[PDB]
Ligand binder design. Structure first.
Ligand code: HEM
Ligand code: HEM
Ligand SMILES: CNCCCc1cncc(CCc2cc(C)cc(N)n2)c1
Ligand SMILES: CNCCCc1cncc(CCc2cc(C)cc(N)n2)c1
Ligand SMILES: C[C@H](O)[C@H](O)[C@H]1CNc2nc(N)[nH]c(=O)c2N1
Ligand SMILES: C[C@H](O)[C@H](O)[C@H]1CNc2nc(N)[nH]c(=O)c2N1
Ligand SMILES: [Zn+2]
Lengths: 411, 407
């Protein structure tokens, strides 16, 4: 089967054959598209085909398909599965797997960088303290004094599902949110629930607008433990605007390192429930979503006031106008401080090239248009005009339930 | 099977049951989502008629009535005898309004029940069609106070007598390829303009030439007509702050009127059914003016604002884009032509969705099309999960007549 996608701006037509290797579900049917839906203990039975599929890909990629090394390895994994009910990846396979999970991540516009990923093998980790050490080293390495480096740290895989390693933080670095008795919110409204958990676990909250949350770390299915990331390791950027001198007085800053820590990495049927990964920010993530979502810091009003825009009619586009200045300021600030960041024009343009490269060399590039298109100025970026096919390949990053909803407390 | 949609801004969750009445396919499968793809007999006819008449009679609280059964009986006889059937005026109006209600790509659907339906099923010639379309244009425009309307021409018979408006929209600007290798006017309209010229149009070769209508009646060869200039309302584009903007020589037409689509009601097919409402600003300011394959004016505007266009990271493109869109809205409002900004329109649509979920059990919506082409996430629709599915009556895409027409 052949599937064509078209770019309506360029008339470039690409042919996808890669989707034939698609395994998991989409959520869609012939009767319904769930393309805008956010979120739509394994037996040896199901496990060996998954291992085999993965090992065949790995051996093909190193051009050793059907080799004795390939066959011996299948044999070794088979025996290990029938003996121990699971298996261990070689370091090479782990690295290959992590890189490909990123490569297959259909919601990530940053994938041109997929082959450059520093993989930190933390499978020898046994305790929360050990996890803390590993994560500190990840943060320091990735931050690199502002010259950001993509990295992932991989903690031991799931066994019976009762001994899971989990990072309870959705991201390694995030600001606390505090609900006030008057209904108002101090800090990041997104993180109110998690902050409360942290407080309940014994965290002493400074109760400011930009308090870096402590790490809440679960090793081997045990109760999670609190650790504070050494502040000297947390790179932050004061936000200012190149022309507006009052912008600094808004009191804004953000952290430089975007680091997802709540996702599950699947490789060859194995499940890595704690696998924090990081890259560098695209400006709009902060300037559009973090700052301007009504459900987040929500600064559009204040900014628009200070720019003295006409705010009586939406039709003045005062919101749009303020939004631009805020995103200019985020980009300006990071650049001025020499902290890696990319604008949505650069990032989407790079993605189109990556995508075309992938069609040519790989036969496709699964992409989720709904996530790939930036949250401002959509149609003046080239991804907007690009038809995309969304499907799911393994290895992959997957959503998993929040640990506080599933954890069995030891006490 | 009973699907939930969440708004991530408000945490509001809606339950959709309406999708279990969908029938047409989406393009998607359990293995592949095609949500971003632009274009993915008596036997066949009677169940379609029945399904439609059932929903019609349910809508007037007369389900299972004798009049319901009588109509069903009558339609069935007519299909058996004549191979097709004729809609009653009431049914036609119901169907047209519901086609719009079911248009999952339309953000303006809160207005769906206020639609003026012009029954042009008595039309027989292209001159007839021309007259009906002029009257539509004049009625819809209403001196700037726009009114939603659709004009419905005779249904398809054997497929060899189709009525077609060859133009994709009732009102659009011509496109010309220059010796300069560049493009004059609207680049999207070059091929159609060629066909107009080849059919005998005398093109003025200007940048904003209103295209002539190319009208096909009864499967005959299409004929040319110029819409009376005085009925084509246009808006010169100026900026409220930038005095120089006027000098760009920009204007646009007040009437957005889609003419290339197929209206399906009760299995019947209306291949010629132009419909119109009123513009959302971004349609003109973002797409028409700033698309690289359209009027593509970003660079010039940016230069007149003297922005640093050295580096993409200055966001000069984004800045110019906002001002271009400010000017569009200002110009329409100043000239008193109905227009809606994307904030107001998406807000309306959220309330409509909630109404539709509350009173109909759902609302089919294509998020890819509903979210505006600028400032996506500062509009409520961005944070609104939507289910996309196909309900009938419906507007459907159809092939361009020049690839179809046996001359
Ligand atoms: C290096 C530069 C990178 C850039 C510019 C980038 C860009 C982005 C952006 C803008 C998003 C959307 C985030 C959101 O809307 O919440 C995203 C999502 C995602 N990225 Fe990347 N990313 C980068 C690196 C990485 C790396 C290193 C990985 C994994 C090894 C990765 C995997 C993912 C995944 C799995 C998602 C989906 C997250 C979710 O569903 O919440 N990215 N990326
Ligand atoms: C009166 C105010 C209206 C507003 C504000 C509005 C808004 C819009 C917008 C912004 C689009 C996207 C168009 C594009 O991006 O090219 C659209 C598409 C559409 N509209 Fe509405 N519309 C209105 C009236 C109507 C009416 C009266 C009908 C039918 C009787 C209709 C049916 C449709 C259909 C079928 C589409 C999809 C067109 C396509 O797929 O090319 N709309 N509308
Ligand atoms: C999933 N919706 C909520 C996301 C909230 C959130 C909070 N902090 C950091 C991120 C980072 C997202 C992200 C991750 C990576 C790896 C790179 C990049 N440029 N961006 C996301
Ligand atoms: C599909 N891309 C081509 C559409 C270009 C195009 C050119 N002129 C008018 C419209 C009308 C879109 C539109 C239609 C209606 C009825 C209300 C509003 N907006 C569209
Ligand atoms: C409902 C909708 O899917 C939701 O708002 C999505 C839209 N696209 C997105 N795109 C990105 N990059 N990040 C997001 O969080 C979202 N949210
Ligand atoms: C590839 C993508 O589907 C295409 O660019 C779509 C995206 N969303 C759109 N949305 C609207 N309203 N109108 C359009 O023409 C498009 N084009
Ligand atoms: Zn889909």
């Amino acid at each position: 089967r052949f599937l064509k996608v078209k770019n309506w701006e360029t008339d470039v037509v690409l042919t996808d054959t890669l989707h034939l290797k698609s395994t998991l579900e989409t959520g869609c049917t012939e009767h319904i598209c769930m393309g805008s839906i956010m979120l739509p203990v394994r037996t040896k039975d199901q496990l060996f085909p998954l291992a085999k599929e993965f090992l065949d890909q790995y051996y093909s990629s190193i051009k050793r398909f059907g080799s004795k090394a390939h066959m011996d390895r299948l044999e070794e994994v088979n025996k290990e599965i029938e003996s121990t009910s699971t298996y261990q990846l070689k370091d090479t396979e782990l690295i290959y797997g992590a890189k490909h999970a990123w490569r297959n991540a259909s919601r990530c516009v940053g994938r041109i960088q997929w082959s450059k990923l520093q993989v930190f093998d933390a499978r020898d980790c046994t305790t929360a303290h050990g996890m803390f050490n590993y994560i500190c080293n990840h943060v320091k390495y990735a931050t690199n004094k502002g010259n950001l480096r993509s990295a992932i740290t991989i903690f031991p895989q799931r066994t019976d599902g009762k001994h899971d390693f989990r990072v309870w933080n959705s991201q390694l670095i995030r600001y606390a949110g505090y609900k006030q008795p008057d209904g108002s919110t101090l800090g990041d409204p997104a993180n109110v629930q998690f902050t409360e958990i942290c407080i309940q676990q014994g965290w002493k909250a400074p109760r400011g607008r930009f308090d870096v949350l402590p790490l809440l770390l679960q090793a081997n299915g045990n109760d999670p433990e609190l650790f504070q990331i050494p502040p000297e390791l947390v790179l932050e950027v004061p936000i200012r605007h190149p022309k507006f001198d009052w912008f600094k007085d808004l009191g804004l800053k953000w952290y430089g390192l975007p680091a997802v820590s709540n996702m599950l990495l699947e490789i060859g049927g194995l499940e890595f429930s704690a696998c924090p990964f990081s890259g560098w920010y695209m400006g709009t993530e902060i300037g559009v979503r973090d700052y301007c979502d009504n459900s987040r810091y929500n600064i559009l009003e204040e900014v628009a006031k200070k720019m003295d825009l006409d705010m009586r009619k939406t039709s003045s586009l005062w919101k749009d106008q303020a939004l631009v200045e805020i995103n200019i300021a985020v980009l300006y600030s990071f650049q001025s401080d020499k902290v890696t960041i990319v604008d949505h024009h650069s990032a989407t343009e790079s993605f189109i090239k990556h995508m075309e490269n992938e069609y040519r060399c790989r036969g496709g590039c699964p992409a989720d248009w709904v996530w790939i298109v930036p949250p401002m100025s959509g149609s003046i970026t080239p991804v907007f005009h690009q038809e995309m096919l969304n499907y799911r390949l393994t290895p992959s990053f997957e959503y998993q339930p929040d640990p506080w909803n599933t954890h069995v407390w030891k006490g």
